[PDB]
Amino acid sequence: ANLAPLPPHVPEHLVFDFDMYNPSNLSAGVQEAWAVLQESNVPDLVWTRCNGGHWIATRGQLIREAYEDYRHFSSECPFIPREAGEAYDFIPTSMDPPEQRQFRALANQVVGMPVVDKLENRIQELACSLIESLRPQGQCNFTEDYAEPFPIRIFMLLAGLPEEDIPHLKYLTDQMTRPDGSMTFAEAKEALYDYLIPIIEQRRQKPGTDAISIVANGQVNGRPITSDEAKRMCGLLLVGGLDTVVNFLSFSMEFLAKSPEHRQELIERPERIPAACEELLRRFSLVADGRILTSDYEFHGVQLKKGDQILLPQMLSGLDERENAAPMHVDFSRQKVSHTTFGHGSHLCLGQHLARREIIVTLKEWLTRIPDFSIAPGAQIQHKSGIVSGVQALPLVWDPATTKAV
Ligand code: HEM
């Protein structure tokens, strides 16, 4: 019945069958679907018999604590169940302190705040270019027409790769995270590595100032980073910034299309866009992965067994009423916007700075040119749930005569 037999160490009163890949009432919205785990009668920590059987921390306090305690909660394979990530081998996902430290520092060198600030004007140009091409059309499939092209073009800029390589590169990343049956994950991954390796070896000899050159010439354990290590980190620097951004932007634009008050608020108070970005990140949080118990451990009165998998939904912390008043409501003026949208602990998103800049630039440049838009008449928006939840399709409409080319 898709149900995994309840392990002896798990008390029956903590059972709550939740399917993270197809939650009940997903039609009400994915965040709302996950919020069922936070209804009054549900414990802070539960066990679901779906997807092979695993724990699920449902409150921000437990989620933050588990992510900080890497000694008890390992990131060896954050995919639950393990088969959900197949041949995944990106760095530094599966590493924990100390091994993890060196790789994070090198990655922070290429996508950290200083780099983001230097790339802002170009990111702004890319955004304006995409929005302006859509403006006169009076409609668009947001996810395909803006959300997807934006992040991949940003990567080419960051990695110093030619625009002409997008069709191939984007096809491969889509084959990996949004498979259509053409290639297996392993095959798509190998093809991605076949693309990266030559560029890495080349820039290892004649380096530039791009992200790949810096990574290729990095130092690990007092010795040059290997071709294997470099490609495995570059692969995540690429894939980690695509679907998360694509879907987050889609959730945010869906909300704005349905709320004229919030659009009007940002048009009249542009200086609030950064704050609005943070509140949208909280309300439309979308990632949910986990950790593995390194040893038998008592956590908040619950006995966890070595090897057990525990889902620690990054999405749930900010939706927790114990963290934020009326969590399902959007308030750009919230004084304390508590969330773990980019994660928490040692694995906190390395691209958080780049992500925030992409969101802020998108909101400013879109609201400046297309201030009044709505969901296409007759359309019904559907969400999808998983490790990175999202929007299937987002058809938008507007009157071109009400827009302004800037
Ligand atoms: C709204 C957009 C984004 C969200 C919500 C997001 C979320 C996350 C989360 C929750 C984690 C931690 C996962 C865990 O602890 O297992 C993570 C890790 C990571 N993300 Fe992001 N991400 C976003 C954008 C980006 C971008 C733009 C990049 C690429 C430039 C990126 C690169 C990475 C990398 C490399 C890691 C690995 C960190 C590590 O394992 O130490 N992310 N992301």
Q: Report the C-alpha gap between 245 and 388 in whole angstroms.
A: 10
Q: Per the annotation, does 349 bind a ligand?
A: yes
CA dist., res. 170 & res. 149, Å (int)? 9
Closest approach atom of ligand 1 to CA 151 = 27
In angstroms, this model's resolution equals 1.6
Whole-angstrom distance, CA of residue 46 vs CA of residue 20:
13
Nearest-angstrom CA–CA distance, 284 and 100: 29
Answer whether 342 contacts ligand 1 (Cβ < 6 A).
Answer: yes
Q: Distances in Å between the alpha carbon of 274 and those of 115, 249, 308, 332, 362?
A: 18, 14, 39, 9, 11
Q: What residue ranges do the domains of the chain occupy?
A: 1-406
How many whole angstroms separate alpha carbon 270 and alpha carbon 329?
21
10 Å CB burial of residue 338 (0-12, 13-18, 19+) is middle
The torsion defined by the Cα of 375, 381, 386 and 390, in degrees rounded to 10, comes to: -10
How far apart (Å, rounded) are the C-alpha atoms in residues 362 and 280? 13
297-305's contacts with Cβ under 8 Å and 24+ in sequence apart are: 297/72, 299/45, 299/62, 299/66, 299/72, 300/44, 300/45, 300/62, 302/14, 302/45, 302/55, 303/9, 304/55, 305/7, 305/9
Does the beta carbon of 212 lie inside 6 Å of ligand 1? no
CB 363 within 8 A of CB 276: yes
At the topology level of CATH, where does 1-406 sit?
Answer: Cytochrome p450 (1.10.630)
Tokens standing for 83? 């088969």
**For ligand 1, what atom is nearest to the CA of residue 346?**
41
Q: What share of the chain is helix, strand, coil (3-state, %, to 5)?
A: 50, 10, 35
Q: Which residues pair with 395 in a beta bridge?
A: 141
- Is the peptide bond between 151 and the residue preceding it cis, with omega within 30 degrees of 0? no
Distance between CA 215 and CA 384 in Å, rounded?
Answer: 34
Q: Which amino acid is at 364?
A: K
Bond into 198 cis (ω within 30): no
Experiment used for this model = X-ray
Q: How far is the CA of 93 from the centre of ligand 1 (A)?
A: 10
Q: How far is CA 229 from CA 85, 107, 199, 223, 322, in A?
A: 19, 12, 14, 12, 41
SS (H, E, C) 131-197: HHHHHHHCEEEHHHHHHCHHHHHHHHHHHCCCHHHHHHHHHHHHHHHCCCCCCCHHHHHHHHHHHHH
Residue 395 gets which letter from DSSP? E
Exposure string for 264-302, b = 16+ CB within 10 A, e = fewer: ebbeeeeeebebbbbbbbbbbbbbbbbbbbbeebebeeb
As a whole number of angstroms, the distance between CA 62 and CA 65 comes to 5
User: Active-site positions?
Assistant: 178, 243-244, 349-351
- Torsion angle in degrees (nearest 10) through CA of 230, 234, 240, 245: 160
| Three-class SS state of 118 | helix
Between CA 310 and CA 55 the distance in angstroms is 4
Measure the CA–CA gap between 377 and 356, rounded to whole angstroms.
Answer: 31
Q: Write the residue with the smallest CA distance to atom 43 of ligand 1.
A: 349
Distance from C-alpha of 324 to C-alpha of 317, rounded to nearest angstrom: 9
In the chain, what is the greatest distance between 2 CA atoms, to the nearest angstrom?
66
The answer to whether the CB of 93 is under 6 A from ligand 1 is: yes
- Shortest-distance atom of ligand 1 to CA 356: 1
Q: How far is residue 230's CA from residue 212's CA, in Å, rounded to a whole number?
A: 8
User: Measured from the CB, is residue 154 less than 6 Å from ligand 1?
Assistant: no
Rounded-to-integer distance, Cα 184 and Cα 176, Å: 8
In Å, how far are 97, 154, 220 from 103, measured between CA atoms?
A: 10, 22, 8
Q: Is the CB of 287 under 6 A from ligand 1?
A: yes
